[PDB]
Write a protein that binds this ligand. Structure first.
Ligand SMILES: CCCCCCCCCCCCCCCCCC(=O)SCCNC(=O)CCNC(=O)[C@H](O)C(C)(C)COP(=O)(O)OP(=O)(O)OC[C@H]1O[C@@H](n2cnc3c(N)ncnc32)[C@H](O)[C@@H]1OP(=O)(O)O
Ligand SMILES: CCCCCCCCCCCCCCCCCC(=O)SCCNC(=O)CCNC(=O)[C@H](O)C(C)(C)COP(=O)(O)OP(=O)(O)OC[C@H]1O[C@@H](n2cnc3c(N)ncnc32)[C@H](O)[C@@H]1OP(=O)(O)O
Ligand SMILES: Cc1cc2nc3c(=O)[nH]c(=O)nc-3n(C[C@H](O)[C@H](O)[C@H](O)COP(=O)(O)OP(=O)(O)OC[C@H]3O[C@@H](n4cnc5c(N)ncnc54)[C@H](O)[C@@H]3O)c2cc1C
Ligand SMILES: Cc1cc2nc3c(=O)[nH]c(=O)nc-3n(C[C@H](O)[C@H](O)[C@H](O)COP(=O)(O)OP(=O)(O)OC[C@H]3O[C@@H](n4cnc5c(N)ncnc54)[C@H](O)[C@@H]3O)c2cc1C
Lengths: 607, 607
């Protein structure tokens, strides 16, 4: 087969044995979707991922897109084009999207499980083909006239981009200087240069591209609150039929050469700099740019974390496959006997430690993004968690920085173990883990760096939230921990919950203290990322133990064969994680409780 | 200037203010080298590394060597060949080499500090140019006839290789099947295929290459003990003048395609398979192969750890230079004020945490390999540490797994922080950190995987050694923590010593219990790598506090200006490491004390 190894069985286990998404199927907007329908779609898309989508994964990296400056055009490998069009011709880009746009209803938890397979097999495909998902947001936020455009965009299959960054405005989006001047007809003319734009051009892959652009109206206020969101197409088009017309003044002027994700054209995109106006329209005809754009960012941050996790999972499964078959060395128990038979390396304790660590974070993080996705539909959140719509929004907001920040960083860190499992062969392009690592590095940077995720998590999702969402998740873990074979694991989780609550209390103390000495805030920043990562380990631990309980019940009821091996692996991985990673949170709490500002007051030249 | 950023000042600090190498200079073999001569040499190689050597760093990766299968030859980029020849013409490969081979005396601590700059600027240069260091080993081990061959190899500038690995014999060197058949004329015919041979061919870069080859003499016993070391030249040569002659029967048949270190040709090397016998000569005319080859392996393991550390250093320095000039966002104390002045990112807490983390491991690991190198000369070890020659060998042996294993893994892990400091630009090939990471990942694999290092460290360097070397080093740390501003840090180091000593006790306990239940050994394997990493952190913490003590003295003695900034940085980094990384060892100890065999008993199919 291909490089991509899927795990539909684990997705089904989470969705329909552990998390309860099955109880929302057959109800609400999912009247005509049952568990069998969702299972079949998952198997169907996993086969597409493993075949036509994965087929161009290697070539996308080895023969990157070619950029021609004078026609401002990017040419993608033909094999990649077919991969994208194989996905689109099957309609996987439209599941969960409004029926007006050609979609059919589906819980986001299932949608993200479906898209996991695409993100694992060839993530850039998902990016180039996000047009309809972009159209969904434009449909939600636009005037009635702009809704017809969104409908057209979805059906003519346009490509799409999210356009915020400028050389001087990356983390600080509010510093952007791309400007917008209103025209007599109500149109606007966009004028500026944007940097690092994913899918900024894609050649003849699509009939059109509609950029969603942040720009500052002439005379607008400063910062992010002064930015407005604009619909700017590559081609002007017939507002009735969608037929592309005159080329609009939006041009790629450069394409970055990157560590990985090479098939995703990361572009310098110029608006109105080449003699042709960049005509655009104010989304919703209101000035509400940063709020509007964050509907896109929220999806971007979910995708990026799910991508990081999809990559770890297939990285782990490739390493496991290799390890079962690689003979090297003798069993440690027969070390003195140098004539002892050679064994497969899964017999070596460090290889099993490595593989169980990979397993725990692949499956642990899979559970985490699926659990997060059960809060992204109010109806699913209601039936699974018994929370009302407002609280579900708060919990999803709480969990997004965890999915993105912990997923990106832990996936990359544990792909190191995947590669280590192959020995020297892991350093070769013959195996895909090398590329997995290069493609995954980006996940801690774009859609907001980890430091921005951790700042958002504490200041916006806990402090501004008054801790409500965190107290809800904490309370669910408390109940789980207070409720035979899993008693030791639950006590380690009780300790980890207490450790994380002590982290949050210390950081809130630093926050409170800042009223007397404002530099106390630096301590919060110093601890923010370790706190973010600790919460992730806590929720991974809990979800894995919820899985282990379902597995114990399945084994007692007489599981046999492959199902028994699946459930046996869940008991072991939940216990392994509890004993090897949860106790580390104790030392981290002590460090966070002890933070000082020595390194803040240090002279910069001392570094 | 170039990508490579050096730190001569820190090397001097370690060598001549902390570690006491100055006491050995001016005496014994080092008559002709004083502190000043060494500082100038470090500065001189500093500049060669930054210029002619770093010149080809980028091209070597983006235009890798071309393999010609019909002539079994590798063609290296011309600019890279210039870099190698610039190193050789300045004689940096012969520093510390026997005078018979064109070298002059130099303590190993200074030699590795010299080579740090080549390894950071273009590590493959060091590898290709290592021929003279190979000859020194040939000179030590050879018959009188072979020592003349070693002289000619050093004088004619030949390249060299170390040839062990086969497809079925990587970590398990003893499974190699390359054969050796003695001829009437006293030579042997080598027959087999070797894999992954660094520098297996180099085109016209050198006049000859002498391969050091492990092979199994006809009728020898199994495992590493049945292997012998053979001298196998690319060209047969006149044994009096060294003039190359007939082509010997050893040919490269493939070159690997790798993640990084691309300009190092990693070759499939075939002996006696292309119709021409591969003539070789038994090194020392004795069958001591694995012990002889381990003289080479010990240098390779020191180099790999030093390379990884050299790479983290220039990664940190590049990120630091970038952080000081990158304007993004405002001070955290003004987060509510959206009009606040923009600041350089060095003002942000998470960036300073990141930078101080990179600093502590770059400088901590530099101290580690320099400390280790003070045991690689008997005269130096006596003057500096007061230990006899045989104990110095044992300590060096103890530390080689630390330098290679901990250096390789921690350098790669912390380069993630370096790249993160660049934000989105770190993912660009426009900056060198992307290449650092790819070039560094191999450090955890070749010259023995991290698991091999951890196994060697415990079973051979602690258990076979009867705790002598470990007891000596721990004794020095015990002394140190029992000796105002460094008091808090001293106590954290004491706790770390107790923690590591508890890890050792637990592992020794598991070893003893293997007398009754031999599976207990598996627990040793499970904790082996974490134990090794913990010792690294202990020794890093210790050395940084030794540096801090020296720095405090210099501060109170009236240091000013840039020297004051240097010394202040050492105080801060030693304290930061003590407070943020040493306490984490307590939880690691608890994990090691609670290891069990559940994941060993688990069915393979359950993974
Ligand atoms: C049915 C089907 C469904 C289909 C749809 C799904 C599919 C769609 C397809 C997805 C496409 C993905 C394509 C891939 C492209 C790659 C992504 C990128 O790199 S792209 C680029 C990625 N770039 C980045 O990620 C930017 C990174 N930088 C940051 O995030 C900064 O922290 C900053 C810019 C927010 C700071 O600015 P500063 O002015 O200090 O900010 P303040 O703190 O003052 O907040 C101001 C206002 O912002 C707002 N708002 C804020 N936070 C949140 C939130 N978390 N959350 C929400 N809103 C949030 C809020 O309105 C707030 O006002 P208020 O409510 O308070 O009144
Ligand atoms: C100015 C100078 C400028 C230029 C400088 C040039 C310097 C020189 C060249 C530098 C290198 C060039 C760069 C090349 C980079 C490629 C490096 C590689 O990958 S290639 C290398 C890649 N491949 C590897 O690294 C192999 C990795 N695999 C291993 O290490 C395995 O553990 C194994 C082979 C030892 C197992 O086999 P098994 O038979 O079960 O192991 P046992 O436990 O039973 O010991 C058997 C005998 O071996 C001995 N001996 C053992 N250990 C050590 C030691 N630490 N320590 C010492 N000796 C050791 C010992 O004699 C022992 O006998 P005994 O004393 O006990 O009676
Ligand atoms: C491959 C790729 C594709 C991209 N595609 C897109 C796209 O389609 N659309 C788009 O809009 N953007 C895109 N970007 C940009 C992306 O959104 C990133 O947010 C951007 O690269 C980050 O800003 P920067 O690179 O200027 O880094 P900076 O913001 O300059 O960050 C540099 C360092 O400073 C730290 N830092 C910065 N500000 C703070 C702060 N206030 N507190 C603490 N630490 C801070 C960061 O964490 C980081 O370590 C892409 C980037 C890449 C690499
Ligand atoms: C770039 C590069 C250059 C190289 N250059 C040279 C060279 O010049 N000369 C040379 O002789 N070799 C060279 N090698 C070979 C290199 O030393 C081997 O790849 C290395 O020893 C690992 O062997 P392997 O690839 O077969 O992995 P394996 O031995 O198959 O290891 C696979 C996995 O099993 C684990 N494992 C194996 N045995 C054990 C055990 N007993 N206990 C616990 N875990 C175990 C490993 O840690 C790893 O995770 C090079 C390799 C590379 C990648």
């Amino acid at each position: 087969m291909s490089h991509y190894r899927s795990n539909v069985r684990d997705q089904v286990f989470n969705l329909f044995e552990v998390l309860g998404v099955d109880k929302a199927l057959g109800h609400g907007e999912f009247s005509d979707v049952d568990v069998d329908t969702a299972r079949d779609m998952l198997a169907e898309v996993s086969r597409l991922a493993e075949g036509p989508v994965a087929e161009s994964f290697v070539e996308g990296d080895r023969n990157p897109p070619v950029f021609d400056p004078k026609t401002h055009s990017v040419m993608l490998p033909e094999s990649f084009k077919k991969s994208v069009n194989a996905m689109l011709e099957a309609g996987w880009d439209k599941v969960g999207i409004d029926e007006a746009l050609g979609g059919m209803p589906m819980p986001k938890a299932v949608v993200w499980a479906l898209h996991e397979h695409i993100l694992g097999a060839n993530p850039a495909v998902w990016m180039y083909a996000g047009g309809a998902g972009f159209a969904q947001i434009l449909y939600h936020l636009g005037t009635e006239e702009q809704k017809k455009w969104a409908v057209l965009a979805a059906e003519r299959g346009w490509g799409s981009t999210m356009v915020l960054t400028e050389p001087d405005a990356g983390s600080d989006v509010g510093a952007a200087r791309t400007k917008a001047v209103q025209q007599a007809d109500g149109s606007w003319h966009i004028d500026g240069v944007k940097r690092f734009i994913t899918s900024g051009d894609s050649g003849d892959l699509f009939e059109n591209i509609f950029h969603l652009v942040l720009a500052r109206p002439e005379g607008a206020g400063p910062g992010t609150k002064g930015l407005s969101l604009y619909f700017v197409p590559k081609f002007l088009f017939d507002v009735e039929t969608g037929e592309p017309g005159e080329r609009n003044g939006v041009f790629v002027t450069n394409v970055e050469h990157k560590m990985g994700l090479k098939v995703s054209a990361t572009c310098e995109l110029a608006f109105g700099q080449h003699g042709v106006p960049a005509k655009g329209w104010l989304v919703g005809e209101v000035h509400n740019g940063i709020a509007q754009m964050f509907e896109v960012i929220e999806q971007a941050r979910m995708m990026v974390g799910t991508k990081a996790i999809a990559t770890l999972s297939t990285g782990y499964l490739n390493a496991l496959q290799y390890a079962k078959s690689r003979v090297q060395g003798a069993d440690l128990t027969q070390m003195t006997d140098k004539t002892a038979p050679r064994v497969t390396i899964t017999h070596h304790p460090d290889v099993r430690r490595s593989l169980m660590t990979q397993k725990a974070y692949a499956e642990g993080l899979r559970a985490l993004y699926l659990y997060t996705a059960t809060f992204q539909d109010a109806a699913v959140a209601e039936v699974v968690h018994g929370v009302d719509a407002k609280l579900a929004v708060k919990v999803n907001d709480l969990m997004l920085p965890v999915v993105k920040g912990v997923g990106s960083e832990q996936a990359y860190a544990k792909l190191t173990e995947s590669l280590q499992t192959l020995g020297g062969s892991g350093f070769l392009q013959d195996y895909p883990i090398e590329q997995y690592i290069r493609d995954a590095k980006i996940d801690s940077l774009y859609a907001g760096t980890t430091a921005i995720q951790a700042q958002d998590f504490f200041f916006r999702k806990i402090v501004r939230d008054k801790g409500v969402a965190l107290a809800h998740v904490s309370g669910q873990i408390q109940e789980f921990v207070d409720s035979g074979r899993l008693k030791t694991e639950r006590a380690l989780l009780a300790k980890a919950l207490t450790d994380v609550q002590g982290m949050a209390a210390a950081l809130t103390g630093y926050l409170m203290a800042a009223q007397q000495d404002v530099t106390s805030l630096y301590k919060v920043g110093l601890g923010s990322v370790r706190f973010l990562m600790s919460v992730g380990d806590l929720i991974i631990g809990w979800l894995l133990q919820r899985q282990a309980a379902v597995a114990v019940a399945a084994l007692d009821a007489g599981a046999t064969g492959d199902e028994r091996s699946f459930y046996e692996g869940k008991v072991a991985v939940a216990s392994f994680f509890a004993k090897n990673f949860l106790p580390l949170l104790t030392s981290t709490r002590e460090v966070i409780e002890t933070l000082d500002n020595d390194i803040m007051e240090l002279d910069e030249a001392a570094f």
